[PDB]
């Protein structure tokens, strides 16, 4: 089976193809449309039968239809598809190879005969039609067996014998070179570079050559046992190797009739001859097995399809899939896809899951949107952001707002005690003396019993934000009702024990379902004296089991079988509201057990609502580390940590989180938010004494004084040298000493508040780092709007750009 791609025959987009059946009997002329992948695109045009056994085939590029077909019996038949003449040599022998040139010149490769040439080149225009034997213009290679030949140009032919590899020019009676090699079968010129050709041998060793290396001699590449064997023994061999006509430095090979390996080559010039090496091999499984030969179909946009002929002679068309070579992500969750075939690059922006929705729901874009909206700079602003647009984040930022208000108002600052951002667990579990800790806890309550540990309960109520009065309870009810959350107000009323107040609140609501729930809750007040076990209690238990709203589930589960342990163990409600009833309506014998179980749950689970219990202690840092391990939310971890991590202790994990969040803010080009984060870190590192503990950015200006040649940094309106008192170096424009505000003039350099800020910003200290010449900011802006050189005499430095 032979498939031979034909160019320069069709004026349309179609590509002509020539085929030979595996029994070597007929020549079929095809026409494959490149843009249609169906099997019907292979159009059969004509079939020329009555051939004995075809050993070689060639076509003429200049004249459409002219096809030369050689045979093993010795007869070359030149005919047309789109006359018919049989020609032969003087001595009849097998035609191994055949080549028809563009200028009508026809060559012939024959077997070994001692009295005749095996490379007979002649023109058909000077052939006598009365004789079968040819009269060759040029004869070469006597007593040899030319097994492959190819026409490089209009004059030279690259012929291959059984022991040599020749290049013969018809204008000279001597071959140009004769390189001895055993890989001399099926010469294939590279369509993108005529200097590179490619033969193989009897053992299957393919070799890509260079003609300049042989002319001057090693092969440029060699592949041991890559193609089929039996080149010398068998005359009817399927070409299982094709050069790429879609792009340079590529070839395809056929292996076992199942896979096609597209070997992509790389080149380097040791400095015109390029030394080749194999860069990548791409394997494509065939659509059908038992493929003997194949050929390329070029498509648009550098596409590739392979017309394949099976062992049974069936011809089918198979596409080459677009394999992605690189899928790089982004800091904006943007995916960029590069193919191995064409040039264009695919992009999946952010604007089995969908790709866009999966990239939109990742935390790398959630953190970016939150940082754009100003997340963490003020906890009340975070709560208002979340409430206007993942409910544990709102709860932990509400607690952080409460604790920051307690610290900022001096409720925990006063005394010989820190107690700053300390959780419920640390207060309840104790830890210089027991009486000393008791009296410093007492002085906090003596600033704004019935239990063995009563002051600890008061401090835990202060930390958790659950020390509101009855009037404050009614105010909180009104505030919660004002947002439309009637269920939350009813839950808050039940939490404080005011069940009739919950009945009143859920009464006169805006929903019929809420009114039915209010009637159900109202069916308890006369029922509290009953022992129970009613069908109504079973109805309430089933309703609490089936309801989706967690607050109404709390109410219906608490009303039937009125114990507090059925409310303060679920994770549906907030831990702050759970501690609002655990510290208020429960006794100290089981409170320590509840606090221990909840702390042990939230430390290893990594819930942000555990900061009620642990605070911003090192155990809180462990909780945040588990949260980072579970969610990769380093933004919330950093903004939580900076409240107390450098101020009260020091650990490396918080430094890692701060550096990572700052690098991510730099990568999103949110430099203003990074600076706000830095000033928030510096503001929150103030201790009770007042010493900063933050690792602030170090000084970058160390001005040398001109009068004393010493450092000025070893005056809110005028800066001078501390050693001698001399002023700063003068401005280059107005010759006034720099570093002084309130100049006698107005620097009007190149909404009244912004204008005044610009005017008072124009008189600053600006200088070039290449020529070290100082200016006012407004003076430098006004000077470089008209000029491009430094204003000092004798300096040539374009400080603008």
């Amino acid at each position: 089976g032979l498939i031979k791609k034909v160019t320069h025959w069709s004026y349309d987009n179609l590509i002509d193809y020539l085929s030979v059946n595996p029994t070597r009997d007929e020549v079929t002329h095809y026409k494959v449309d490149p843009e249609n992948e169906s099997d019907e695109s292979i159009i059969k045009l004509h079939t020329v039968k009555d051939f004995g056994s075809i050993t070689c085939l060639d076509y003429s590029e200049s004249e459409i239809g002219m096809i030369g077909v050689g045979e093993k019996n010795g007869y070359l038949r030149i005919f047309n598809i789109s006359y018919d003449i049989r020609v032969r040599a003087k001595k009849q022998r097998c035609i191994n190879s055949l080549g028809i040139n563009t200028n009508g010149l026809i060559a012939m490769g024959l077997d070994r005969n001692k009295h005749d040439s095996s490379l007979q080149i002649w023109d058909m225009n000077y052939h006598d039609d009365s004789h079968e034997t040819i009269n060759p213009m040029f004869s070469y290679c006597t007593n040899e067996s030319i097994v492959s030949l190819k026409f490089l140009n209009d004059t030279s032919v690259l012929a291959a014998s059984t022991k040599f590899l020749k290049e013969i020019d018809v204008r000279s009676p001597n071959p140009i070179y004769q390189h001895p090699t055993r890989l001399t079968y099926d010469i294939k010129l590279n369509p993108f570079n005529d200097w590179q050709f490619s033969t193989y041998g009897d053992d299957g060793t393919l070799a890509i050559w260079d003609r300049r290396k042989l002319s001057d001699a090693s092969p440029l590449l060699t592949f041991e046992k890559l193609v089929g064997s039996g080149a010398a023994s068998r005359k009817y061999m399927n070409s299982c190797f094709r050069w790429s006509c879609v792009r340079n430095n590529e070839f395809a090979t056929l292996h076992r009739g199942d896979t096609i390996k597209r070997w992509r080559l790389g080149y380097y010039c040791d400095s015109n001859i390029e030394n080749l090496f194999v860069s990548s091999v791409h394997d494509t499984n065939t659509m059908y097995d038992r493929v003997a030969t194949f050929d390329y179909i070029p498509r648009s946009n550098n596409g590739t399809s392979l017309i394949c002929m099976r062992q049974s002679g069936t011809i089918y068309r198979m596409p080459i899939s677009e394999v992605c070579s690189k899928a790089i992500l982004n800091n904006r969750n943007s995916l960029l896809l590069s193919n191995f075939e064409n040039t264009e690059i695919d992009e999946i922006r952010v604007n089995f899951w969908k790709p866009e929705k999966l990239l939109e729901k990742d935390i790398s874009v959630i953190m970016r949107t939150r940082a754009s909206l100003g997340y963490g700079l003020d906890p009340m602003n975070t709560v208002e952001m979340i409430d206007s647009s993942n409910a544990y984040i709102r709860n932990t930022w509400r607690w952080i707002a409460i604790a920051k208000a307690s610290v900022d108002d001096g409720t925990m600052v006063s005394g010989d005690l820190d107690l700053g951002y300390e959780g419920v667990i640390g207060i309840w579990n104790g830890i210089l003396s027991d009486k000393q800790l008791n009296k410093e806890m007492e002085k906090i309550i003596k600033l704004r019993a019935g239990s063995p540990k009563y002051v600890q309960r008061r401090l835990c109520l202060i930390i958790s934000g659950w020390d509101l009065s009855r009037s404050d309870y009614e105010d909180k009810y009104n505030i919660i009702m004002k947002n439309g959350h009637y269920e939350k107000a009813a839950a808050w009323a039940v939490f404080f024990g005011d069940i009739p107040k919950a009945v009143e609140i859920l009464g006169s609501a805006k929903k019929e379902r809420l009114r039915l729930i209010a009637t159900a809750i109202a069916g308890y007040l006369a029922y509290k004296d009953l022992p129970g076990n009613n069908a109504w209690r079973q109805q309430c238990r089933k309703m609490s089991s089936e309801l989706d709203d967690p607050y109404l589930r709390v109410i219906f589960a608490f009303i039937a079988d009125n114990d507090w342990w059925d409310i303060l163990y679920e994770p549906a409600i907030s831990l702050r509201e759970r501690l609002g009833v655990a510290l208020r309506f429960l006794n100290d014998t089981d409170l320590t057990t509840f606090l221990d179980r909840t702390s042990s749950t939230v430390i290893e689970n990594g819930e942000l609502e555990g900061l009620i219990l642990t605070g911003i202690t090192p155990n809180g840092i462990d909780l945040l580390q588990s949260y980072v391990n579970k969610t990769s939310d380093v933004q919330s971890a950093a903004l939580i940590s900076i409240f107390g991590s450098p101020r009260y202790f020091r650990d490396q994990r918080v430094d890692e989180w701060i550096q990572t969040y700052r690098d991510m803010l730099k990568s999103w080009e949110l430099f203003s938010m990074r600076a706000r984060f830095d000033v928030l870190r510096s503001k929150l590192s103030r201790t009770k004494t007042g010493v900063l503990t933050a690792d602030i950015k170090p000084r970058q200006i160390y001005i040398q004084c001109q009068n004393c040649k010493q450092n000025i940094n070893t005056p809110r309106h005028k800066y001078c040298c501390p050693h001698c008192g001399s002023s700063f170096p003068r401005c280059a424009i107005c010759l006034m000493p720099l570093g002084t505000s309130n100049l006698p003039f107005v620097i009007n350099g190149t909404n009244r508040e912004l204008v005044s800020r610009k005017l008072k910003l124009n008189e600053w200290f600006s200088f070039c780092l290449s020529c070290n010449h100082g200016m006012h900011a407004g003076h430098a802006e006004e000077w470089f709007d008209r000029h491009n050189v430094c204003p000092t005499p004798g300096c040539t430095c374009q400080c603008n750009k």
Binding site: E224, Y268, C269, C324, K326, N330, F352, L358, S364, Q625
Partner: protein, 310 residues
């Protein structure tokens, strides 16, 4: 999946983002580097500059850290690494927007991967070609960025690979400034984690096992603050191996390697693997024409997600 045509006349080999994600640089076998920018108004990828760089196919380019300027390195098959600095006082789409800085001619082999070091280690660089030699170049002179001095020169492979056998080399730095200097180096079928010892020389620190065939891509997951380092690996097999690295003679700290997961979903060769900014999404491309995204749900084990066909 909106496509934009980059304009190369041949196969686009390496596409890399910058730090800010608004610039992409594409290198190809037409010996050209094209830098594209994303306008905030048009919201489309427009070409900034295209210029001829090497005498062979450019196969690896990388951006430097933005605190050192605008530097693009470029590795090609002509055994050279060229450094490209951008002068903003030149016209776009002119070929003179990016000025050449240096040529690193020390490589006796066609280079495959170049990755810049993280910014806390300096203006370093890494090289890996078909000679088995890992080369590190530092810009120790602050006045001019044209004198890049070779500092480290290891030998990943004993002998260079043969002319006719395919080979692949990939590099990956550790982007953590709270850990010693590491470099994930992939040989043909060997993956090595290096460390900078107390003597100032690179030492073999750990070896990622498995890897029955060629390694196409190595990607270190970004250090978000977690206590374990993650390395993703795409092989010539269908395997996407994710290694969990935990860190605790002449090395600062020893480190252990645990194969977290191994997935055979591609049924081909995993050509590239890449991470997100936070290391939560793993993008892998294979010979099935599919790009698969991977995430860790309910545990540390990575599970598949959206599959994008092309």
């Amino acid at each position: 999946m909106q496509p934009f045509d980059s304009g190369h006349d041949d196969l686009v080999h390496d596409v890399v983002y910058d730090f800010y994600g608004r610039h992409v640089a594409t290198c190809s076998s037409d010996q050209h580097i094209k830098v594209f920018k994303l306008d905030k108004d048009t919201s489309n990828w427009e070409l900034s500059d295209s210029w001829r760089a090497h005498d062979s196919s450019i196969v690896a380019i990388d951006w430097a850290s933005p605190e050192y300027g605008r530097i693009i390195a470029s590795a090609s098959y002509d055994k050279t690494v060229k450094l490209w600095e951008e002068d903003p006082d030149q016209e776009e789409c002119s070929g003179r927007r990016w000025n050449k800085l240096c040529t690193l001619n020390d490589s006796k082999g066609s280079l495959y991967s170049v990755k810049f070091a993280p910014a806390h280690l300096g203006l370093k660089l890494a090289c890996l070609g078909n000679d088995g030699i890992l080369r590190l170049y530092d810009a120790l002179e602050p006045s001019d960025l044209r004198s890049w001095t070779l500092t480290s020169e290891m030998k990943v492979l004993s002998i260079p690979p043969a002319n006719h056998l395919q080979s692949d080399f990939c590099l990956s730095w550790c982007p953590s400034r709270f850990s010693p200097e590491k470099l994930a180096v992939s040989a043909l079928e060997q993956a090595i984690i290096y460390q900078r010892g107390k003597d100032g020389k690179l030492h073999v620190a750990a070896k990622l096992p498995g890897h029955k065939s060629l390694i196409r891509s190595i990607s270190w997951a970004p250090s978000i603050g977690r206590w374990y380092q993650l390395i993703a690996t795409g092989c010539k097999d269908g395997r996407i191996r994710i290694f969990k690295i935990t860190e605790k003679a002449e090395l600062q700290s020893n480190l252990q390697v645990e194969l977290l997961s191994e997935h055979d979903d591609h049924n081909g060769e995993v050509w590239s693997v890449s991470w997100n900014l936070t290391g939560t999404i793993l993008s892998s491309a294979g010979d099935d024409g599919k790009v698969r995204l991977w995430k860790a749900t309910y545990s540390n084990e990575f599970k598949c997600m959206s599959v994008i066909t092309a």
